[PDB]
Amino acid sequence: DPALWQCVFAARSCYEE
Amino acid sequence: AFTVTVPKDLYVVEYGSNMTIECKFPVEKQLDLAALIVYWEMEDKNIIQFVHGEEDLKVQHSSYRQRARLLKDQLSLGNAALQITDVKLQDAGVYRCMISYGGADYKRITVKVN
Ligand SMILES: *CC(=O)Nc1ccc(NC(=O)C*)cc1
Ligand SMILES: [N]
């Protein structure tokens, strides 16, 4: 699911920031 | 049914060299940028986010900024091509490409670094 992929990249990036 | 394939699911590479792992996705006649979603990740790090022709560099993990590179020329050819310049030991692990082009599928590639 490409929508699911966007959510995980958003969460993980937000965590690294 | 849309299926992603990989030529090699194991890459053995030398430390400090360049590498390009590939994910092949079905493209027919022309590429529709407005319909392609491509994702690259390894372990718990974002590498590439490229959604309908827009690449977001803010989401890319810091250890891959200035080294990680998606060769968009190959996209017209149906090839998701991840280029990492000057690979490190930390670049070893399980990689994953995620493509959406109509349907959606993913495959995994192991990268080992000598
Ligand atoms: C589905 C989705 O968009 N999830 C999501 C997760 C994280 C964030 N941003 C932060 O966590 C900072 C946005 C959206
Ligand atoms: N932060």
Author numbering:
A (entry chain C): 1 to 17
B (entry chain A): 18 to 131
Article, verbatim:
We selected the ECD of the transmembrane protein PD-L1, which binds to the ECD of Programmed cell death protein 1 (PD-1) to suppress T cell function, and which has not, to our knowledge, been shown to bind α-helices. A screen for PD-L1 binders afforded two clusters of Helicons (C61 and C62) that were both predicted to compete with PD-1 on the basis of their on-phage competition behavior. In vitro competition enzyme-linked immunoassay (ELISA) confirmed this prediction for FP28132 from Cluster C61. Cocrystal structures of PD-L1 with these two Helicons showed that the two clusters both engage the PD-1 binding surface of PD-L1, but occupy distinct α-helical sites on it. The asymmetric unit of the FP28132 / PD-L1 cocrystal structure contains a symmetric dimer of two FP28132 / PD-L1 complexes. We have also structurally characterized two other Helicons, FP28135 and FP28136 derived from the same PD-L1-binding phage cluster, and observed a similar assembly. This revealed an extensive series of contacts between both the two Helicon protomers and the two PD-L1 protomers. To assess whether this is an indication that the FP28132 / PD-L1 complex is a dimer in solution, we performed analytical size-exclusion chromatography and time-resolved fluorescence energy transfer (TR-FRET) experiments with PD-L1 in the presence and absence of FP28132, FP30790, a non-PD-L1 binding mutant of FP28132 that differs by one residue (FP28141), and BMS-1001, a small-molecule PD-L1 binder that has also been shown to induce protein dimerization. We observed clear evidence of PD-L1 dimerization in the presence of both BMS-1001 and FP28132, but not in the presence of FP30790 or FP28141. Taken together, these findings demonstrate the ability to discover multiple α-helix binding sites to a relatively small ECD that was not previously known to have any, as well as the ability of Helicons to induce protein dimerization.
To target disease-causing proteins that are inaccessible to small-molecule or antibody therapies, we are exploring the use of a nature-inspired drug modality that exploits the intrinsically favorable properties of synthetically constrained α-helical polypeptides (Helicons). Here, we report a rapid, high-throughput screening platform utilizing phage display that enables an unbiased mapping of the α-helical interactome of a given protein without any prior knowledge of its structure or known binding partners. Analysis of 14 high-resolution crystal structures of Helicon–protein complexes across six different protein domains reveals a range of binding modes, all of which are “side-on”, i.e., mediated exclusively by Helicon side-chains rather than involving main chain amide interactions. Biochemical and structural experiments demonstrate diverse functional impacts by the Helicons which bind these sites, including inhibition of protein–protein interactions, inhibition of enzymatic activity, induced conformational rearrangement, and induced dimerization.
